[PDB]
Amino acid sequence: PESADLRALAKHLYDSYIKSFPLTKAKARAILTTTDKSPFVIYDMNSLMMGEEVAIRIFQGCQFRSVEAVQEITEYAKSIPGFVNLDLNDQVTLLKYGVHEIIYTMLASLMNKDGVLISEGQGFMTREFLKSLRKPFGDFMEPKFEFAVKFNALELDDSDLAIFIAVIILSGDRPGLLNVKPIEDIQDNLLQALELQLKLNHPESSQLFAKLLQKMTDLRQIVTEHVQLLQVIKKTETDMSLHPLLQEIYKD
Amino acid sequence: ESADLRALAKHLYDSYIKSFPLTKAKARAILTGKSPFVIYDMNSLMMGEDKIKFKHITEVAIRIFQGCQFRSVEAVQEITEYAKSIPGFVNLDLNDQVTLLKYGVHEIIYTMLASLMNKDGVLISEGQGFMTREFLKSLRKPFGDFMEPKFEFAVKFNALELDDSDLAIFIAVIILSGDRPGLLNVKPIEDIQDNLLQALELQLKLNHPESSQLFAKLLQKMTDLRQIVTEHVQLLQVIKKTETPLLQEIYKD
Numbered sequence A: 001p002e003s004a005d006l007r008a009l010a011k012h013l014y015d016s017y018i019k020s021f022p023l024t025k026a027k028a029r030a031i032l033t034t035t036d037k038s039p040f041v042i043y044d045m046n047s048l049m050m051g052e053e054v055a056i057r058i059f060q061g062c063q064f065r066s067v068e069a070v071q072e073i074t075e076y077a078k079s080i081p082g083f084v085n086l087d088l089n090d091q092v093t094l095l096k097y098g099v100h101e102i103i104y105t106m107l108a109s110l111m112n113k114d115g116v117l118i119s120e121g122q123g124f125m126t127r128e129f130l131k132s133l134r135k136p137f138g139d140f141m142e143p144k145f146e147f148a149v150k151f152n153a154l155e156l157d158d159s160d161l162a163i164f165i166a167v168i169i170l171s172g173d174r175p176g177l178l179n180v181k182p183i184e185d186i187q188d189n190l191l192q193a194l195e196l197q198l199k200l201n202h203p204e205s206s207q208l209f210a211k212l213l214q215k216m217t218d219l220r221q222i223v224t225e226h227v228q229l230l231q232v233i234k235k236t237e238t239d240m241s242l243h244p245l246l247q248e249i250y251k252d
Numbered sequence B: 001e002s003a004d005l006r007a008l009a010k011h012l013y014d015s016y017i018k019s020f021p022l023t024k025a026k027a028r029a030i031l032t033g034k035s036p037f038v039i040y041d042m043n044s045l046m047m048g049e050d051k052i053k054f055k056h057i058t059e060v061a062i063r064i065f066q067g068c069q070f071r072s073v074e075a076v077q078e079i080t081e082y083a084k085s086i087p088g089f090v091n092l093d094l095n096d097q098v099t100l101l102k103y104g105v106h107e108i109i110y111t112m113l114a115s116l117m118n119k120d121g122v123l124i125s126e127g128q129g130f131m132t133r134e135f136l137k138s139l140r141k142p143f144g145d146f147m148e149p150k151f152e153f154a155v156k157f158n159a160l161e162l163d164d165s166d167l168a169i170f171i172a173v174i175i176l177s178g179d180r181p182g183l184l185n186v187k188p189i190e191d192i193q194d195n196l197l198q199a200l201e202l203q204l205k206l207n208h209p210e211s212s213q214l215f216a217k218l219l220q221k222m223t224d225l226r227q228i229v230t231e232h233v234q235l236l237q238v239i240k241k242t243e244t245p246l247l248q249e250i251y252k253d
């Protein structure tokens, strides 16, 4: 039926997602669970030193990946049908507020309860090593880990994720949007696509669609705690700097 | 099974009716016209206190806040009784029942508060009154900023045009959240909620067939509710930091 259109939309978004994100969840899980693709593990200072201030070295590295990620997400967004046709100011707005939610959603795919893949999967940084950086740097990663642990339990694959993150981008409740309605119509179509996708890809997973949507609460709260941490760093490390792209994303 | 979900929908509606005296259908009749005393300024407030029987009258802003808390306490008892009607709820671990209510009553209170609101104000005292939104945000800081976010929420929420039969099932879903901190047996909670969510989905499709993804949009509101509740405590604490005994006990939250 029009189901066909919805499948086509799912298929389109999956395709674009692979084109946009060079480290998929499927690649990630395969690394986490071979010989040619095993990661070097950083769990302390010497492992770090052999892998290549320390907490600032790590934070800066985290910044660069963050900037790279926003770049990927921007490319993916433009593939979402209708997105580029929206008012430019709104495109920018949608990007600014969607970027964190997508970054942490996808970061889950790179995480297990013990650590997180880095440097395209070549490296693996342990939760405890990150939990042991000087305050409050030692505390930026725990809520992401906790979220990922619950989120990974949903057992979503890349094809699921492609649609879900498209749904996130097209959030008409973002502050300062000029034309809510066209955004909401793209999102309605994306939601229907997502719903169908979940029903077909996880036909035993009861009300998975609802549980996925419910996980927006946790995402929201994570973003909030993160900006608070950024505000402390601002005043303590005045020698330090946020990347301009990241600056603009946190302005309001 | 599709008949069973409607059985559940109907049971929850009947219970909701027995538990919540002032329903949305009732409130909306009163807001549109078919008649309440209005509070739009300081003079009208005073006249309202000697017209409408207020049960909390024991600054001005403080008096209004205390009344809002009297009501909330009342609502907690209504929500509690309603939750007992939710199939499976009583059969849950007693500590878990207590936890679901404790973390759930606030989201539900704001949910139902929206049934009593429009862009211009809110029904009070069982619909005998109506306090204007302008008169609320005319109150001194921090008090002028406490109902505004509720109003913004309600406007958004009320646009979904839910009725009481819809809301009954939505509220039950909220109570049966398996992510409340400190639960001991999450399984039967999520189980019940799954059943409630199937019920809700079927309810909305049969009662709002023209609204394609109403289910999803309602689910998105649940996160809005958590944001509201989270933000509300951040003000509530500082209110215990402006208010300076048995009474404090009665309203310990």
Ligand SMILES: CC[C@H](NC(=O)c1ccc2c(ccn2S(=O)(=O)c2cccc3ccccc23)c1)c1ccccc1
Pocket: A058, A059, A061, A062, A063, A065, A066, A069, A099, A100, A103, A107, A110, A116, A117, A118, A119, A125, A226, A230, A246
């Ligand atoms: C968009 C927000 C952004 N980034 C994050 O909040 C964040 C944190 C850890 C991340 C990512 C993306 C990957 N990881 S990671 O756990 O794999 C990671 C943690 C620590 C150092 C890393 C260094 C390089 C690559 C990944 C790293 C984003 C941000 C904002 C301000 C400052 C720093 C970072």
